[PDB]
């Protein structure tokens, strides 16, 4: 996920919540000044069509085992993939 601008109700507008690190906390309240305080706090929902989606695929990679010494064990490394 990246932005995921939720849609408000009464007076509309938009707000875009940044997707940072792994996760984010969803918000409700109202950010819009119009729905805010009068009257009273406008309700807002996320719109999936509006959001920008980036493909995400994760995969772990173990060592080739020729690169492993006389001892120890193959050690995998986790790899995140995006876009194209």
């Amino acid at each position: 996920v990246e932005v995921i601008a939720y849609t408000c109700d009464q007076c509309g507008y938009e707000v875009f919540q940044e997707v940072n690190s792994r996760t984010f906390t969803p918000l409700s309240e109202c950010t819009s000044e119009e729905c805010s305080q009068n009257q009273t706090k406008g309700q807002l929902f996320m719109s999936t069509r509006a959001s920008k989606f980036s493909a995400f695929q994760e995969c772990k990679i173990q060592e080739l085992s020729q690169q492993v010494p006389v001892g120890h064990i193959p050690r995998s490394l986790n790899i995140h993939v995006n876009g194209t």
């Binding site: 085992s65 020729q66 006389v70 001892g71 120890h72 193959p74 050690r75």
Partner: protein, 489 residues
């Protein structure tokens, strides 16, 4: 804390008079800049405890009795001396050789008189917890206000001494309200690991269970030891964690788990210098040397001069030749030994192993996969590359494996199509094998074939098939007797 200053000004003097360490620091500062001019060395200076007693006994007794107050001012002093070096274009680490000990203890004898005091444990290391990063220095970039912003994270093992815990997460809009993005790759990560240490199996008193304690290995020390290795750790003996007393009802008695920080990790059980290479050079000209060499292998073993000759000729092995745009011809030489038991065939191989410079030993079955990667969801011959693989009871091994050994030996490569990762990976290993005769002692008289028991191409793959007889004679017997006798004295 002017006394911490005292410790620093005191440790200063120790260095540069005498200057015997300073040359090593200079060497560390120079070598890396030489790598900077090229076209790896851990930064720590081993301190022999030997030298510390000559200057001050007061400061010597302290490092052992109360290392928390002493090692870190000495350390800050070492960095301070590393910065006065040359020049511009890190915390380092102490080591502490010794001159043990007091404080000499095996892990079985320890706790608590030895706690919060430097310690050299020794024993077997298992199971060697898996290597992992650990965050230390937080680094961020503000914009457009700019500058450069950093936080410093203090963990449980930070420095030595206990400090009010910094963790966790990220500062994220330190005042005023400017945005802070995490700057990765400027920020510092010290690697971190822990490995538990069991007391030596042979000095165990009774059927009483073994008592192991855990050692955290900071920085460079990481991945320096595989599990099951003889190790003499050193370190400060630290008790971390609450005993449950921190939280109010944790009612159980059990508490204060202890471990050792740092520090050195000297293993226990090449460098040719100036003189050695000269010895070789002199010795190369002598015409008879080959026979002497061939005799040097066997203090305990009669005759078999031919076989010993062979083992040398495996240790050396015909270079390696890889043709242009074509396959390579096998360099190394493979050997088999067949004869009645008591032939030392299993005894010879261990001495092969010791001086071999590598490689892995394998006995019969054995396996699974032998040399293979096994394609682990979700081996030896590979790991033994450029080395000497031993095989004991080479006959007993299942044909299924032999089928693979054909591919290993001559072809010189291993191929894994299994599921899976599909690759041709290289195991070029040299190989020895000792294998019992077919049935009983019958090897001697029995025919040139039907005696071997393991047809066919294998018989060929092995460059040399040596046969040895246990058949008995009185004269040879006497000549056995005396050497056997003298051997035990």
């Amino acid at each position: 804390d002017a006394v911490f200053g005292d410790r620093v000004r005191r440790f200063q003097e120790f260095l540069d008079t005498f200057t015997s360490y300073r040359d090593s620091v200079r060497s560390i500062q120079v070598y890396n800049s030489n790598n900077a001019a090229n076209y790896i060395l851990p930064h720590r200076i081993i301190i022999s405890l030997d030298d510390l007693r000559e200057f001050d006994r007061s400061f010597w007794s302290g490092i052992l009795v109360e290392p928390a107050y002493f090692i870190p001012p000495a350390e800050k002093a070492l960095t301070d001396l590393a910065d006065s070096m040359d020049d511009v274009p890190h915390p380092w680490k102490l080591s502490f050789k010794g001159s043990f000990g007091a404080h000499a203890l095996s892990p079985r004898t320890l706790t608590a008189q030895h706690l919060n005091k430097l310690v050299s444990v020794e024993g077997i290391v298992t199971k060697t917890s898996l290597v992992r990063p650990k965050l230390i220095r937080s680094v961020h970039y503000a914009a457009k206000t700019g500058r450069f912003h950093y936080r410093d994270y203090t963990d449980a093992t930070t420095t030595l001494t206990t400090r009010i815990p910094t963790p966790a997460i990220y500062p994220t809009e330190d005042t005023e309200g400017n945005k802070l993005t995490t700057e990765y790759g400027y920020s510092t990560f010290i690697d971190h690991q822990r490995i538990t240490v069991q007391e030596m199996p042979e000095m165990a008193p009774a059927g009483q269970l073994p008592r192991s304690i855990d050692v955290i290995l900071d920085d460079d020390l990481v991945d320096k030891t595989k599990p099951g290795d003889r190790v003499n750790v050193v370190g400060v003996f630290k008790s971390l964690g609450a005993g449950g007393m921190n939280q109010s009802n944790s009612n159980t008695l059990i508490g204060f788990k202890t471990l050792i920080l740092g520090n050195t990790v000297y293993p226990l059980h090449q460098m040719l210098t100036d003189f050695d290479i000269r010895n070789i050079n002199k010795l190369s000209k002598k015409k008879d040397i080959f026979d002497i060499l061939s005799q040097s292998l066997a203090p305990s073993i009669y005759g078999h001069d031919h076989i010993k000759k062979a083992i040398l000729l495996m240790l050396m092995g015909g270079v390696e030749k890889n043709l242009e745009n074509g396959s390579h011809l096998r360099g190394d030489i493979n050997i088999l030994m067949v004869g009645d038991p008591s032939t030392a065939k299993s005894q010879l191989l261990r001495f092969v192993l010791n001086t071999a410079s590598l490689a892995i030993a394998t006995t019969g079955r054995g396996s699974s996969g032998v040399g293979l990667t096994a394609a682990v969801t979700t081996g030896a011959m590979v790991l033994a590359d450029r080395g000497v693989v031993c095989i004991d009871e080479f006959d007993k091994m299942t044909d299924v494996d032999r089928v693979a050994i054909h591919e290993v030996m001559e072809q010189q490569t291993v191929t894994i199509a299994k599921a899976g990762i599909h690759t041709t990976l290289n195991a070029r290993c040299s190989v020895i094998a000792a294998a019992n005769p077919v049935f009983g002692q019958y090897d001697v008289n029995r025919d040139p074939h039907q005696n071997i028991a393991l047809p066919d191409s294998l018989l060929s793959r092995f460059d040399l098939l040596f046969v040895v007889t246990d058949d008995i004679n009185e004269i040879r017997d006497r000549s056995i007797s005396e050497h056997v006798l003298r051997t035990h004295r």
